[PDB]
Paper text:
ATP synthases are macromolecular machines consisting of an ATP-hydrolysis-driven F1 motor and a proton-translocation-driven FO motor. The F1 and FO motors oppose each other’s action on a shared rotor subcomplex and are held stationary relative to each other by a peripheral stalk.
Despite the presence of a high concentration of ATP in the buffer used for freezing specimens during ATP hydrolysis, State 1catalytic(a), the least strained of the State 1catalytic conformations, appears to have MgADP bound in its αβtight site (left). In the presence of free ATP, ATP hydrolysis occurs at the αβtight site and MgADP within the site is expected to inhibit this hydrolytic activity. Therefore, the unstrained conformations appear to show inactive complexes that are not part of the rotary sequence during substrate turnover.
Author numbering:
A (entry chain B): 27 to 405, 412 to 509
B (entry chain A): 256 to 383
C (entry chain C): 26 to 509
D (entry chain F): 7 to 475
E (entry chain D), F (entry chain E): 240 to 359
G (entry chain G): 224 to 276
The structure:
Amino acid sequence: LNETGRVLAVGDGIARVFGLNNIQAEELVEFSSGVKGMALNLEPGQVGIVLFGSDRLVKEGELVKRTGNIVDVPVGPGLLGRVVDALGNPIDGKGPIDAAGRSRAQVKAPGILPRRSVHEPVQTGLKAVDALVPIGRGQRELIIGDRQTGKTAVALDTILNQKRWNNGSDESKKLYCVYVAVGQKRSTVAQLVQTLEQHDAMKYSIIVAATASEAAPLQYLAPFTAASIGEWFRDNGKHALIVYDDLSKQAVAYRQLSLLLRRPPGREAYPGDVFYLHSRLLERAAKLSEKEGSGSLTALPVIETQGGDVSAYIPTNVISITDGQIFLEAELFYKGIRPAINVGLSVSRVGSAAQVKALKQVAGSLKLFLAQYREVAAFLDASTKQTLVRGERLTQLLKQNQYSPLATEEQVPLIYAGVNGHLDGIELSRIGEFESSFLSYLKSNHNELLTEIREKGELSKELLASLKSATESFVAT
Amino acid sequence: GEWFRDNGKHALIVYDDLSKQAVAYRQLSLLLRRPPGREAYPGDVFYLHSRLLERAAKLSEKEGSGSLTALPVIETQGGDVSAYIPTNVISITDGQIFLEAELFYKGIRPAINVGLSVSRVGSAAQVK
Amino acid sequence: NLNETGRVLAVGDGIARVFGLNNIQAEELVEFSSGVKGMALNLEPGQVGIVLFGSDRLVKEGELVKRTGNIVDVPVGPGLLGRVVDALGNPIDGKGPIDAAGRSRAQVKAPGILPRRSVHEPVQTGLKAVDALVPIGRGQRELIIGDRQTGKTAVALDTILNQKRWNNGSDESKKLYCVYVAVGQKRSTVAQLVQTLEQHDAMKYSIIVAATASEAAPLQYLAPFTAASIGEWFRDNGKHALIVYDDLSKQAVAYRQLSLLLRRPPGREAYPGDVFYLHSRLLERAAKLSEKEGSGSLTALPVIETQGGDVSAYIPTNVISITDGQIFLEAELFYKGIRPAINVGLSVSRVGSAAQVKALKQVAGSLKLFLAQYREVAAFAQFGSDLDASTKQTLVRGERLTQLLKQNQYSPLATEEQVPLIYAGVNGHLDGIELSRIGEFESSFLSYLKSNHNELLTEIREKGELSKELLASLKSATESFVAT
Amino acid sequence: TPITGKVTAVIGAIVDVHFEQSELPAILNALEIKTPQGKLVLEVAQHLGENTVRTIAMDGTEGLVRGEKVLDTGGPISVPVGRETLGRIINVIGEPIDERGPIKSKLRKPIHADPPSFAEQSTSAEILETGIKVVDLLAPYARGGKIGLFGGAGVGKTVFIQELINNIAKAHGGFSVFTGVGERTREGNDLYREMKETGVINLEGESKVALVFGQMNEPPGARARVALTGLTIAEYFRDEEGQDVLLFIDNIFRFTQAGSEVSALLGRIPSAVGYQPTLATDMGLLQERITTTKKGSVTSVQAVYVPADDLTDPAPATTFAHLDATTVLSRGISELGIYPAVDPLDSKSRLLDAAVVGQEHYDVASKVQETLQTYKSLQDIIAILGMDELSEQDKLTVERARKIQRFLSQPFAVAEVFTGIPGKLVRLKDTVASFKAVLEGKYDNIPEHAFYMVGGIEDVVAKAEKLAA
Amino acid sequence: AEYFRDEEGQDVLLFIDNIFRFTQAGSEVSALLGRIPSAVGYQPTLATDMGLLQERITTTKKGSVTSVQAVYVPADDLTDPAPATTFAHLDATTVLSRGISELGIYPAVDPLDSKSRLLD
Amino acid sequence: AEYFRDEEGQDVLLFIDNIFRFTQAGSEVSALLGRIPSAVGYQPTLATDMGLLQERITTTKKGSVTSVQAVYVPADDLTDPAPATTFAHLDATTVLSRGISELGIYPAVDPLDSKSRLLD
Amino acid sequence: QGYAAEISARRNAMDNASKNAGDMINRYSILYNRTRQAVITNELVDIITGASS
Ligand SMILES: Nc1ncnc2c1ncn2[C@@H]1O[C@H](COP(=O)(O)OP(=O)(O)OP(=O)(O)O)[C@@H](O)[C@H]1O
Ligand SMILES: Nc1ncnc2c1ncn2[C@@H]1O[C@H](COP(=O)(O)OP(=O)(O)OP(=O)(O)O)[C@@H](O)[C@H]1O
Ligand SMILES: Nc1ncnc2c1ncn2[C@@H]1O[C@H](COP(=O)(O)OP(=O)(O)OP(=O)(O)O)[C@@H](O)[C@H]1O
Ligand SMILES: [Mg+2]
Ligand SMILES: [Mg+2]
Ligand SMILES: [Mg+2]
C-alpha cells in the first residue's frame, strides 16, 4: 500500500483512505471509478481525501491509486477560446486541450522585488469607470454590489472592449481574458458564452466554469486553477485579465467543505481561514518588472452583498485585499442610472497613474466634483443651482448602454464638453441624443482630433483649443 | 380523540401548551446526546408537531363521519411569532386566534387581536 | 516513587498533563525539575492537569515533577505597604525583600452570617457625585462599570488618593489601607500608577499587586484571590482596608483561557460554568466585622468593562448581581463635559444613606430628587416644545446642579468642602450664576470660606452634623457671597 | 550528531514529528526539512507525548511526505540583527529577499524573548508633533509611547501610516523598523520605492530604516512569527545600540488572526466567535516587548484592523488595553467625504491632560468635543424634523459643529493621488489657534465648504476669498 | 416547611430569596456533568428541575403553605428562559419595573404587568 | 418532468409548493446526520443541495421543464439565507397581493413588484 | 393670511417628517433583520462548541 490504498469510510464528500504511505500532501488521487480527489489531511495511518465529484461515485473497500502529482491544471495558448471546468477538462464538446505545460493550482504569489507599480491602463470602455475609478494593468479591483445590479455586465463589457486591440500584432497592448464562473447556473454560463461568440470576443478569452451543481471542492478550486491559467500569460510577458464571478459563492463552497471536515465555525459561521483563501487567490494578480518581462494579470473579483452591507464579513475581508472597489447600488439601478456606479464609496488606490493623460486632463477633479454634487443634492441659491444643473446633466452624461463600449478617443470629447460647461446649452433629457449626434459629427468632420487623441494619448494646448472650438462649433447647433 | 374520530363521533382536543411539550422533547434529545439545532432543539421538532397536528381531520361520509378538532396553544415571548416553535406551529395549522396583552389591559377581554387573527377554512363552515 | 513525584506526559499552551503524583491534593503547588512552578487543577484517574506559572518552553516531555506539599498561599503583614508584588507575592519593584507577619492561603472561606455587622461608617472618596448621591460604606462592595476609557481607573485612584487626610493621622480606626490589583494591564500603566502615587506621596499606605498581560494566564487568574488574602490580614487585625480590582473582566478572560486549555466543558460565551462562582467567592470576602471580631473591615471596588455599553452581557450581569452597589460611567456624558461621567440614573448604592456622612446627608437630601425631575423635564424639552415656568425652574436648577458635580482629576475634595457646594446647589443662591462660570464660582467660594468663614468649615468637619444654627449661617454666607 | 526525527502527520500548516531518541527538541525550537525547493522551517508548538512533537510550518506544507526526515537546529528561529540590517528586506526566517546577498551581521538573535522587567519600565510625557490636525488636537501622540490606528477595511489606515512615516521618520534621528504583518505586497513594494525616492534608503551609502515583511499571501504561521522578527530587530536597536527607535506595524491584528487560523488544527476548543483561547496572553507576550525602557526609547505605530467594522470584536477589544493613544477611523466619516476619517470623539490619548499640554490647549479640545457630542446627540431630531426645529442655541451649535467637522479634514501629501490638493502639514500651535478662533465665533460668516481640505484658519480665509469669486 | 405542613398541621409561610439562584446553580454544575448546554446556556433539565422543586410547595388537604419567592430577572428581560419558565408556577406575579423605580416611584410595582389569580 | 422532456419532447411545467419547505427538510436531514449547522442554523451544503435540484430544470435540444415555485420568506426578510439561495436561481418573480385583490384586480398580479430577467 | 400659511407649513413639515421617519424605518428594519440573523448564529455557535466536547 505504498503507492496505493483502500477506502475505510466515505461521507459528506470526505473519504478516509488506509495506506498511501508515500503520498504527498495536496497530491491528486484517482479512485477506482475514475473520479479524483485531493489528499488534504495526512493523519497517521490514514489519509483524508476530499472528492472532486459526487460522493456516490466512491464506495467502501475500493482501491485508490496515487497520481504522483500535486493538484495541477493545463496552461498555454491552446486553452484560448475553450471552455473548461476546474482541473481543466474540456467541457465545450470540442477536442482535447493542447497545452504548453501544466502548473500547480496553488503556486505562491510573486514576492516584493519582482513587481512594478501599475502604470498602464485597462480601457474598460465605460465612461464612469474609465473616468472616475480607473483600473491599471495588474490592479485588483473589486466589483461589489447587491443581486442584479449589473456586476457581470461591467466585467463582461470590460472583456468585450478589448477587441479593438486584440486583433493586432502588438502583444504589448493586447489583453487576454479569463472568466471564472463559480456557483452560477449552467444555463447562465452557456448564454454568456453565446454572447461572447456573437460579439466575436471568444477567440481571445477563456471560460472556467464550476457550475452550481458541481461538488463543493470544485467550486473551491476553480479560482485557483483559473489564476494558474492566467499566470502563464503573466509569466511569459503577456497581459491577462481574470474575472471571478463570484468570490462570495466560493466562500460559501469553502464554508461547506470546512464544516463537513468539522473544523470549528467562526464569525458568521465562516471558518477563520476564509481570509487566507481570498488573500492567496488574489495576491497572484500582479505586474512584473522589466527583468521578468513586464507581464501582468489584472483581477476583477465580484462580490454580492445583502442590502448594500459593505460592512459584512466577507465584503470587508475582500476589500482588505483588493486595491479598490467599484460599488454598484440598487437604489440607483432602480430609477434607471446604469451602470449605477456609486461614486461615494468607489475608490481606486492606484488608479490615477493608469489613465491616459488626455482622459485625466479632461476628467480633472471629477471625483471631487461629484462628491460636492452629493452635498448639494442632499439639500434656490444660484451657486448651488449652477452646481445642481451641472450635476444632473453630468450624471446623465455618465449613463451608458450595455454592449456599447466607447473608445477612449470618443470618451474624451464627451467628458470635455460636460466638464468645461457646454452641456448647459442642452436640456438633460436629450443628452443621450446629443452624444449619438456629436460623436458621429466628430467621426465625419475633422477626424483629425480622434486620430491625434488615439495616437498621442495627451492633449497639447493646440489639441485642447481645437477641441474647445469644435465642440463650440457643434453646440451652437 | 382518534377513537371518537374513527367511530363516527365528533371531538375537540386542546393542547395546552405545545411549547412546553417542545421543551420536554428538547430535554430528552439533549440528554440522549442527539445533535442540536436552532435554539438547541433537535431538527425533528417540526416533524414532532406535524406528526401530532395532522391527526385532526373531518373524515368523508364513507370512512365513518366523525371529526377531531384541535386547538393547540402557544405562548409567545414578547410577541415574537418569529420564534422557532411559533413559526413551525403557525406553518402547520390552518389559522390563528391571536391575543395581544395590550388589548387585555384596555379592558378588551377576551382580547382577540382581530387584525392578526385569521381562519382559512372556518369561513366555509360558519353558521349562515 | 510516583506518589510524591510525577512524570510529564504532554505539555503545551501552558498546560502540562503529568503522570503519578498519586498523593497530590487538589489546587496544590508543584515544582518542575526545570524550576518553573505550577498548580494542579485537574485530578483524573491517571492524569494530573497542572497549569504553569511561567513559560512552558522550559518544560520538556519526560521531565520530573516534585510535589510541594503546600496549597497556594502568599505572604501577609504590614511589610507589604509601599511595595509592588506579583501575583505570588514576590517583590517586583526591586527594592529588596519583603517582611511578612505570616502566610495565608489564596482562597479562604468568607466571614459567615454571625461575625458580620451592619455597614456602619463612610468611605469618603473625595468625589462630589459619589459622596453626595451614591455613598460607599466601609465593608461595602461597589462595582465600577463602564466602557473603555471612561474614567474608571481615575475614579478608583481618586478614592485612593483622598485618604491622605486621615492616613497621616494618629487614630487607626480612621485610616484606610489601599490594595490595588492590576489584572491584564500593560506594565507601563502600572509604572505610571506608581509614579502618580509617589508624586502625590500617597503610597505610604498602599499595596500594588500586579499580574500584567504577558504573565501566564494562571497568574492573571490567581491575582485577585492573593490580593484579597493580603487585605484580609488588615481586616482580621482590626485595620480597615480597601481593595480595587482593575479589572475582574480580564480575570474572567484568564479563567476562560485556563479552563478551556484544560478542556473542561465550556458554558455560555465559552466561559466555564464556574464563572459566577469565581467572582462570588472572591467578592463575599469583603466584610465589616463585629465588635467581637476586632471591628476591622475590608471594602471592595471591582471594575468591569462593558463592550459597546452592553451592560446586559454575561460577566457584567454576574458582577451586577453580586455587588451591593453599582456606579455606571457613560461615554456620552464624558464628552458633554460631565466628568466624572457617573450616570446618576443607573447608579445606586444599596447600603444607602446609612453609610453617608450625616452633614452631607442633610444637605444632599433633595439633590437626588432635583436630578430625577431634571432627567424627565430636560428630556421633554429636548423635543422642542415649550412648557410652563415650573418646568423651567426644574430645568434651570437641574442644569446648575449637573454643572456643579463636575470635578478636576486628581483633586479630591473633603466633605467640609463638598457640604457648602451641595448646600448652595440644593437650597439655592447658586442658581442665578451663568452656567459657563459655575466653575469660577465653585473654585472661589471655597477659597472665600477658608478665610472669611473658617469656623463653619471647622465645625462641619469636627462635629459632622449641621444644627439649625449652622444651616442659618450657611444660608447667610451663601446669600452674602453670591451677591458679589 | 544532529537530533533527527520523522514526520508522522500533516494537516494544513500543522506538522507532527516523531523522534526515535529521547533527546526531544524544546518548544519554540526550529526544525529543518530539506524539501527540494529550499529548506522548510518548522516551529515546535507543543509536546503531544509518545515522543511526538507538534509544530507550525513557516512555509507551504505541500510536497511533504510522511516519513521525511527532520533535523533540529538546536534553538529558536534566529534572525540577523545589527546596523547591517538597515536598508535591507528580510523574511520571517531572517533570510534576505531583496536579492542583494547575505546579511553580514556579527550577531544573530532569537525571536522569542522575555519582556523587560518592571524595574526597567520608564514613563515620560512628550508630544510627538505629527503635523495632523485632529491627532495633534484631540489625541496627541507621544514619543516613547504606543500608538494605534483602529479602522475597518479601506478606511485609510495605510495612507495614515505612510503620512506619519513621511513626516516623522526623516526628522527623527534614531533608526526605524517597518514590520509589514499581513499587508498587501504592492504596499511593501511601494513603500520600498518611496523610501528610495525620499532618500531614507541608499544602496550606495548609509540607510536608517529596516524592513521586515510577511505579506498576506504567506501561510498563517509566518504571518504569526514575522511580527516577533520585527520586534527582535527593534529590540536590538533599542537595548544594545542605545538608539531611539521607531517601530511601524501594519497590521498587527493579523498576528491575532493567524493564531486563530492555526488554533483549530492545534487541537484546541475555540473561544468566542472562533478565536483561540490564548488570544489575550499571546497578544500580551507579543505586545509587552514593544515598550520603552531605561536603556532606550521605542515609539511604535500599530495599525489595527477591525473585522466587519465591529470595534467590539475580541481582537480590537483586547488590543485597546495595550495602547497610550488610539485614533479610531470610521467608515461613516469617510463616506461623508471627510478624510483622514478620524472619529474626533472615539479617539483617545493618555497625553491630553492640562498638566501636559497646558490649560489653553486642553480647554480648546474639551470645547471641540463638547460641540461635536452635542451635534451627535441631535442627529435623530435633525434627520426626522429638519434643522428648522432646533432651538437657536442648538442651531448655532450645529452650524459650528458642522464647520468643525469639515475643518478637521486634511489633505496628506501621500494622498495627492486622490485629493488633487497638494499636501499640507499643520503645526500644533497653529492648530490650537485656528480652533480657538472658531470656537469664539470669529468666523461664523464664511460657508461650510471653505473649511474643507485646508490647513489652518488663514487657508480657510484664502479659500473663502476663492469661493467668493 | 413540608414537615410543618404534613405533621404539625400549622399554616406556613415559606419565603425564598432568590429562586433564580436555584436555576442558575443548576446551570453551573450542568456543564461539568457532561450535559449539552440548552438555549442561552441553561441546563436541559431546567423545566423539570423547576417542577421538582416548585410542585412540592402546595396546600394539600392536610395543611397550607403560602410561598412568597423572589425571582432575579437578568438584564431586566422578562423573556429570559429562567423567569419565563418560573411564571408558569405562580398564582400572583408582582413584576417590579426598572422604569417605575427610575421615576422615583417605590415600591416600583408595574401596575399593568403584575397580575393575580384572585382578581375576580 | 425529466422523463417527459428527455423522452417525449414536451415543454413541461414542474410546479413546486413550497420550496422553502424543501430547504427546511434539507436542514432537518442535515441536523440528524450530525453535520455542524451553517449560518442561522441552516444546513451546510445548502447551496449545492439546492443546485442539484434546480440545475436539472433547464432546456435541451428536445424540450424544457419550466418550474413555477411558491416561495415563503420568513419574517418578511428577503435576505435570509434560504430566500437568498432561492432568488439566486430564479429567472422571474410573480408577486400576488392581498391589497390588489381587494381592489377587484384579478388574478391580482402586482404589475410593478413582479419582475423578469427576460423582459429584455 | 398668516394662519393659512402656518397651517400649510405644518402640513409640509409633518409630511417631510413622515417621509424621513419611513426612511429610518427602512434602515432599522434592515439592521434588525441583520442583527436577528447574527444573534441566532452566535447563540448556535456556543451550542456547537459545547457539543464538540
Ligand atoms: N448598461 C446597462 N443598460 C441596460 N441594461 C443593463 C445594463 N447593465 C445591465 N443591464 C441589465 O441589468 C440586468 C442585470 O444585469 P447583470 O446580469 O449584469 O447583473 P448581475 O449583477 O451580474 O446579476 P446576478 O446577481 O444575477 O449575477 C440584465 O437585464 C442586464 O441586461
Ligand atoms: N474627571 C476627569 N477630568 C478630566 N479628564 C479625566 C477625568 N477622569 C478621567 N479623565 C481622563 O480620561 C482618560 C481615561 O481615564 P482613565 O485612565 O481613568 O480611564 P479608564 O476607563 O480606567 O481606562 P482604560 O479602559 O484604558 O483602563 C484619561 O485621559 C484620564 O486622564
Ligand atoms: N487624506 C486623504 N484624502 C483623500 N482620500 C484619502 C485620504 N486618506 C485616505 N484616503 C482614501 O483612503 C482610501 C483607502 O486608504 P488606505 O489604503 O490607507 O486604507 P486602509 O484602511 O489601510 O485599507 P486596507 O485594509 O485595505 O489596507 C484610499 O482610496 C484613499 O482614497
Ligand atoms: Mg451576475
Ligand atoms: Mg483604566
Ligand atoms: Mg491598509
